[PDB]
Amino acid sequence: PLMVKVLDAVRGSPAINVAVHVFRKAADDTWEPFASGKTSESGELHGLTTEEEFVEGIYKVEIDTKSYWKALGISPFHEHAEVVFTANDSGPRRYTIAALLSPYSYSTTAVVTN
Amino acid sequence: PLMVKVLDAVRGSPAINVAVHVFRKAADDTWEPFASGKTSESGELHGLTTEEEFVEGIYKVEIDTKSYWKALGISPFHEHAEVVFTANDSGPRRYTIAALLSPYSYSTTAVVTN
Amino acid sequence: PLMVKVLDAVRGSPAINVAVHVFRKAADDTWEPFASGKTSESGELHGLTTEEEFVEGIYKVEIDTKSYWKALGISPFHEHAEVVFTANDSGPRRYTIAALLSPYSYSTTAVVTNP
Amino acid sequence: PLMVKVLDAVRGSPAINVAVHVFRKAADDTWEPFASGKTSESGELHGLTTEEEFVEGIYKVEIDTKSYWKALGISPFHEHAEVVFTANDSGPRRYTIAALLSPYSYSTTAVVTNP
Numbered sequence: 001p002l003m004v005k006v007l008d009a010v011r012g013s014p015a016i017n018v019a020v021h022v023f024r025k026a027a028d029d030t031w032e033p034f035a036s037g038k039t040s041e042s043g044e045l046h047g048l049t050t051e052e053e054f055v056e057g058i059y060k061v062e063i064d065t066k067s068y069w070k071a072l073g074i075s076p077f078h079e080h081a082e083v084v085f086t087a088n089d090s091g092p093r094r095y096t097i098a099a100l101l102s103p104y105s106y107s108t109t110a111v112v113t114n
Numbered sequence: 115p116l117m118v119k120v121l122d123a124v125r126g127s128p129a130i131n132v133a134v135h136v137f138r139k140a141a142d143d144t145w146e147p148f149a150s151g152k153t154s155e156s157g158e159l160h161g162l163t164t165e166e167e168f169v170e171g172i173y174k175v176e177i178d179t180k181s182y183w184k185a186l187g188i189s190p191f192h193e194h195a196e197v198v199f200t201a202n203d204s205g206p207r208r209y210t211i212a213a214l215l216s217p218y219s220y221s222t223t224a225v226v227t228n
Numbered sequence: 229p230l231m232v233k234v235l236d237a238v239r240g241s242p243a244i245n246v247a248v249h250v251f252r253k254a255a256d257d258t259w260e261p262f263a264s265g266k267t268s269e270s271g272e273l274h275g276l277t278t279e280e281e282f283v284e285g286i287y288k289v290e291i292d293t294k295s296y297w298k299a300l301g302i303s304p305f306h307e308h309a310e311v312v313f314t315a316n317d318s319g320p321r322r323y324t325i326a327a328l329l330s331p332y333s334y335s336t337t338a339v340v341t342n343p
Numbered sequence: 344p345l346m347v348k349v350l351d352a353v354r355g356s357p358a359i360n361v362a363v364h365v366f367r368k369a370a371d372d373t374w375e376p377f378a379s380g381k382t383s384e385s386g387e388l389h390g391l392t393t394e395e396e397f398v399e400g401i402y403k404v405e406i407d408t409k410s411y412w413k414a415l416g417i418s419p420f421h422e423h424a425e426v427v428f429t430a431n432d433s434g435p436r437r438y439t440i441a442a443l444l445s446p447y448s449y450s451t452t453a454v455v456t457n458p
């Protein structure tokens with residue numbers, strides 16, 4: 001029910017081998033590790049979770065943008081990109097979190113479908 | 115070799131049934147019709163052209179954003195969104211033109227791969 | 229009543245010396261030249277027009293992004309960024325067209341105010 | 344040396360009365376409150392800090408987008424927009440953090456200048 005897609009606005013390409021960490025907000029308001037992986041050759045990270053595990057709650061998707069730019073020999077602005085959202089059962093069932101990266105900027109959108 | 119993808123930043127969804135027109139710049143500097151279609155349920159328009167037909171040149175992708183917003187009962191700012199670019203044979207072979215739409219803003223990116 | 233602001237997402241800076249051409253749709257449906265200029269050291273272009281001259285119409289703001297990236301020695305994707313809009317159709321407004329540039333992507337937004 | 348600017352992509356207007364909280368990473372790796380405020384009628388928030396107080400560090404600018412869209416009666420996707428960056432590590436700079444908001448999307452950029 002959760003996919004992450006990362007694109008590179010400098011090169012016009014998928015952002016490949018980017019580390020992505022997902023956290024779930026715990027009852028004590030700390031962030032607990034939930035899922036992680038590296039984006040593929042297509043800039044996508046599939047298979048993070050299952051419908052059973054992905055219960056309603058607040059989630060954070062952290063994208064390791066700084067390492068990505070450093071590997072390309074570029075000095076970037078941000079430490080990482082964060083996307084924080086609530087998963088809601090009455091909304092559509094599948095969430096795609098997309099991020100478009102530049103050295104000093106990023107944009108993100110959610111595509112939520114059934 | 116050309117795909118167009120359109121997303122809605124207000125609803126968090128693909129932008130469905132959006133008209134898209136592609137033009138090729140002629141030798142007299144006018145824009146000639148090249149390809150057109152309506153985005154699908156996934157917000158994508160596939161099958162616009164073939165490798166044989168998609169020669170080097172300057173192309174314009176016009177997305178009929180105004181009709182899209184009007185159909186949702188929303189008054190938008192732009193008449194349409196335009197994306198104008200050169201197709202180059204020495205670059206990668208497949209072009210995805212992506213647009214993210216809001217009533218008073220849009221963003222676009224190109225993902226060019228082999 | 230018309231201002232254009234351009235930022236560079238690679239440098240984290242204003243996009244300076246960007247050429248901007250504005251056109252207005254004529255009665256015969258062609259694009260007539262309306263005004264032009266270049267962004268300053270602040271990435272802003274002021275003074276394109278006056279409230280008298282900026283009548284109702286369909287306007288196109290063409291931002292010459294390829295010339296900007298090539299002047300910097302960089303090969304970008306787009307030829308330019310075009311913003312096309314109806315202006316002043318419920319009376320005079322003030323328009324700021326802002327653009328954020330990367331080599332293979334741009335974002336644009338409008339801020340419309342009623343003086 | 345720190346300014347935050349927020350625009351609304353639905354209205355084509357400044358995003359007014361948006362709460363912004365800034366944090367700074369402490370020695371113990373926790374986020375310490377640093378400053379806070381609300382955007383004005385222009386969508387800008389000035390006066391968060393001083394050049395003396397804005398020392399080298401890792402800073403987080405949290406823009407309370409959900410409170411903004413809910414204050415407007417709208418149900419948005421994100422809880423907030425977070426911008427996290429190292430500041431002043433090659434000496435004092437001036438930072439503008441700009442954000443463009445939609446219910447299911449946002450864009451942010453930084454303009455970094457050397458006074």
Ligand SMILES: Cc1cc(/C=C/c2ccccc2)cc(C)c1O
Binds near residue numbers: 007098109119212221
């Ligand atoms: C312009 C833009 C494109 C994208 C890319 C969306 C996308 C999604 C699936 C396939 C290709 C592109 C993402 C964001 C956050 C953007 O601002």
Ligand SMILES: Cc1cc(/C=C/c2ccccc2)cc(C)c1O
Binds near residue numbers: 326328336348350443
């Ligand atoms: C198109 C756009 C404009 C803005 C606004 C930029 C800005 C900054 C200072 C003054 C005016 C506009 C911000 C972002 C993230 C954007 O994608």
